[PDB]
Amino acid sequence: EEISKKFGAEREKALNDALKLIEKDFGKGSIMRLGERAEQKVQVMSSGSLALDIALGSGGYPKGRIIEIYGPESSGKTTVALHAVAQAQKEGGIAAFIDAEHALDPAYAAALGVNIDELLLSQPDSGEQGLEIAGKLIDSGAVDLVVVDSVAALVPRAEIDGDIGDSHVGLQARMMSQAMRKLGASINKTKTIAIFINQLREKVGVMFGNPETTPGGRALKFYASVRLDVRGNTQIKGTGDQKETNVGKETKIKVVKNKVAPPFKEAVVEIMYGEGISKTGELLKIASDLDIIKKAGAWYSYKDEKIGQGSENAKKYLAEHPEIFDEIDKQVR
Amino acid sequence: EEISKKFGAEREKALNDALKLIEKDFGKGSIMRLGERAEQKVQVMSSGSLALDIALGSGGYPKGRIIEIYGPESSGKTTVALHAVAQAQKEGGIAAFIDAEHALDPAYAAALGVNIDELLLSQPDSGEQGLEIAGKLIDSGAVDLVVVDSVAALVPRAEIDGDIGDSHVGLQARMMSQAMRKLGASINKTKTIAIFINQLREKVGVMFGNPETTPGGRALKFYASVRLDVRGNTQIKGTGDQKETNVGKETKIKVVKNKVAPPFKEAVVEIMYGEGISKTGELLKIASDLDIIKKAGAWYSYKDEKIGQGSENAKKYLAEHPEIFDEIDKQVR
Amino acid sequence: EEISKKFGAEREKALNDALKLIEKDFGKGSIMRLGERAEQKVQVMSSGSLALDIALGSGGYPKGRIIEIYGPESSGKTTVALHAVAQAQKEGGIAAFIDAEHALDPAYAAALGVNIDELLLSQPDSGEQGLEIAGKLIDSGAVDLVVVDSVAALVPRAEIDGDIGDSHVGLQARMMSQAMRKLGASINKTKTIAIFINQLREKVGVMFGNPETTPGGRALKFYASVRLDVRGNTQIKGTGDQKETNVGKETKIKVVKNKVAPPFKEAVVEIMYGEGISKTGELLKIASDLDIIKKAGAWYSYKDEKIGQGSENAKKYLAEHPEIFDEIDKQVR
Amino acid sequence: EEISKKFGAEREKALNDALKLIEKDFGKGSIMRLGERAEQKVQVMSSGSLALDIALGSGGYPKGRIIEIYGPESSGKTTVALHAVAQAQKEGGIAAFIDAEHALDPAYAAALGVNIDELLLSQPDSGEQGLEIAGKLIDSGAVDLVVVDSVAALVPRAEIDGDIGDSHVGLQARMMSQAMRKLGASINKTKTIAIFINQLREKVGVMFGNPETTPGGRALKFYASVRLDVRGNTQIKGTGDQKETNVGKETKIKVVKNKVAPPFKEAVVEIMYGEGISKTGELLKIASDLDIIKKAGAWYSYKDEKIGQGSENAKKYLAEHPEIFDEIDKQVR
DNA sequence: AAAAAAAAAA
DNA sequence: TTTTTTTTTT
Prior knowledge:
Oligomer: homotetramer
Shape of chain A: globular
Distance between the termini of chain A: 62 Å
Structural class of chain A: alpha/beta
Subunit structure (chains A, B, C, D): Interacts with DprA; probably forms mixed DprA-RecA-ssDNA filaments.
Largest interface: B-C, 61 and 58 residues
GO cellular component, one term (chains A, B, C, D): cytoplasm
Order of helices and strands of chain A: HEEEEHEHEHEHHEEEHEEEEEHH
CATH class of chain A: Alpha Beta
GO biological process, one term (chains A, B, C, D): SOS response
Number of domains of chain A: 1
Largest sheet of chain A: 10 strands, mixed
CATH superfamily of chain A: P-loop containing nucleotide triphosphate hydrolases
Binding site for ATP (chains A, B, C, D): 71-78
Radius of gyration of chain A: 24 Å
Keywords (chains A, B, C, D): ATP-binding, Competence, Cytoplasm, DNA damage, DNA recombination, DNA repair, DNA-binding, Nucleotide-binding, SOS response
Number of strands of chain A: 15
């Protein structure tokens, strides 16, 4: 016979028996009160560019969660991922960049100074084998940054064999959702950062909202903790061979979904072709905005008096003087 | 042989023997009349916002029933659950927030008034083990409010070990139905409130109505008693450092299925980031709608006349004026 | 040896000996001819709404048979059962409503006119024991209307003790068939009505008709005699506080299987929240269809000429006029 | 001492001594040859519909054999047995219709022409009591068509008294086989027709053929001689009250196992509610197929020219013209 | 506006 | 002696 009619008793030792019975089967940290749940606090890793994570509040992507990137074509998708790869690899944590569209140039990564010899990579044929590779590489290993590019190009297995022009209703999104339901609970276990980047397809006929959307199904936007999109519009003509020649592209990044900081605070980044995120280009620009450095004429007056008035102002010697860096940024932080 | 031909007699002594014979084998509270079944009446727990539980008719979530939440991406489906947790915790009833998608930040809970040290929690890997943990914690427990988040993420065991991209027809809903068939009878016996929140997936091809649905199968919607879904779209820019800066998210709450009150009566709440339900914001907002407080220009004229016309109007002193609270709500209640 | 080669003789005194032989052992009411079996004729009981049991041909659910209700969520599966309880209870016959999904609010029964103190009830944990309660209460009792709710919730004993996510091949249907095979022969023998209400679960892969079904096995759909199902679609906003506010839900009722009358004849019922079946609200609608009442402008011309043109037209004075009802219905039955 | 090991010698007078030894000990009808056993010819009784027993090859149910009927829900399992009862009752043969599920309404039989005062009947509770009544009424009686309905409801003794939901493995089929081994050799001795009608329960997992079966075990399917199943899917709306109103149910009848005629020859029958098998409806339908009557437009031209083009075409005057029946059936049988 | 193929339990 | 939906694409 079973146990009789029970109300919650008005003294609370009874759930201690439930705690002891839970600990019999499902380990040790299955039920913890939140006060001594020490690893539940947010852990932060930066993004290289200070203006990017002046917007994310904390100071970078929170560990153990899902971040994702999307936006229009040729507008700064892989560059931010490469800079996060280099900044993450600068503390010895191993980073793994799988591919889907085979677009990564090795010398472009060499131009951003990231190590090719300690960069894992895979170019899968189908999307299934590549995402399986990422899944098996995350859980057993202690790698630090897994990054899947171009979820549009993760083709599913059941249409890589069929003829071109067959009906395949609901096959990309089902694979992506059934994949991330498996990968969701494992990633926070190992405190690892994952970024899925994306492309854009339209959606034909809606009377509300913006007519753009991402592919890969609606299961992605639920799980992710921070969503950034980029909208690269114009380029800047520098003093290339003392002439107005295309040498840098202007862009902007704004956060769309966020849950560790207030959202919708945007950011402006400059990108030079073949050179990536100009951190020295944004450092002296943004420090004159809150005026911790001087805003003046040809010389921003300091102890050195070696400042030109151009796109090059102080980068010739702040490479050899990195010691001004710490006292000019963390004040807003 | 057995008893002879039965028709019920035209005097009702015979069923008293059946009442005695039922009482011999199945306890005492097996068969009662409805007149003296005193614990069958509904008990109500509110959820912080006066505007929310003015829309539920009774005055909050009914005890011993099943409530459920859904809604589109990032619309404060988790914050209303957190507020229900805090309002339940403010009376000493121990509340247990398990997880499935690993999204709860501890400092977000500390901002919303709920105590960290008296909140049970669990972040299981398998959904099956976590739901078993919740069910076993309910029955012997004296707990008051259990809550599972994100039933999309309660993955079953039969696909947590299989390869990615395998056919698993009818596996989520079977786990959910076979779970709630077990947990249906135990919950009303201990007068305990449980809420299941959810996400949204599409549905390919329906000629009538809405193309939206919830995952986790149809079996959840039957067992529930109150179903609220929220749809947050826009935001409000206040006077953040005297500038239109993103400080509050606007949303609305409507009920769909309800069986302890009139249904479909909706509600409007604004939410500030890092602050949750602006209860002092909705308080004077709804109070001038029935004119229990005055509506005028820069001063909504009362006996003290300390009223601005902004986002901050009178919350600076009604936070320390508790006596306005009980006399501006019970008139409609 | 035994009796020799016997063909049936061409004179019929021989079966009278067999009648005396069956009369020797198995009582008196074993073999009777159909010409004098006076209790084999159908007895009826009305069901509150006139338009409901106009559609059933006879005039209500027949006694001694099995009635089953199903349908999608929140569509008056429970309220039509409550109205049958009230209509059966109005003539002194004691009714017994068991509970399985713990949804019967007492004040909802209070507003629908059924007496609280003369309603038997049970909320069993294992559905096996609940069917045991109903079976033991039927046969010895003189109870008039038993009704089992929510046969999805009648859980079997063999999985109320096991873990969640255990394989339990074909356990609901075997218990339902094993209860109903015992309960079938006893129900007609005491001329008593049973009502089994249900839910809806889908079914994977059928290329014909409807993909929907009921749970609880195919045993139930055989034994039942009259099968109603409801599909509530829309609601009506009356002149509540002279405003379009939700006060009535619209629904329809069609029979599917019937064996006392022609089938497939449907009906249309309004349901007001907190009011149930407005019999006055369907009374004037069905009476104007065959025009025993007048169809005119704001005034329909009778001996009073006090009729409005709204949702409320004449229910103010037919509440005090009991003589109108018996002469406006008998012409179609 | 016994006789030696012998071969049957090459002249056959010795077996006549064994014939005399057999007939001395077991009567006269013990051993008879092929020729002078005149009652081993098949005797045929029709079954109301000409289109039904035009598909059984012979012309109806063969006497002294076992016929079984099964099919899905509400598909005229009951009405074909009723029509066989009526057609067998039309020649003074006494019919015995015992029940198991208490479904027979007497007025439904009153509409179908079967006489009520000469129809024996019983509604037992035990299955062994019902089969005992059938057995004790067959062997002494001169009864002509015994019929047990719905062998799914012939509950055995050992679970009509025990608790509900107990292990009762192999109890239905054991009672059925132990009935049929006793009843088989007695039925053919008195040339009586017995028909069992049945129900359908599924079978858990077979990847070939049909997943459906009958209950009652595999003992019945051996002993049967003609096996029919009915599958009623659609209905037909005639010109009832000059409107497309539900008045006709459509179905088909096919045979599965047969051993007096070639099998698998199907049939098509319309059924009207409250009217049964429209033999006058099928009559002109089958006659136009071999075109012994005229197939034309609004008038099929014969000597009277009183034929419409509707559902009602010739039934108004073929009721008064009984001489048209014999010229349609004798050409094909 | 038109679209498909999937299984493991007694 | 059945139990159970999963998901957009342009």
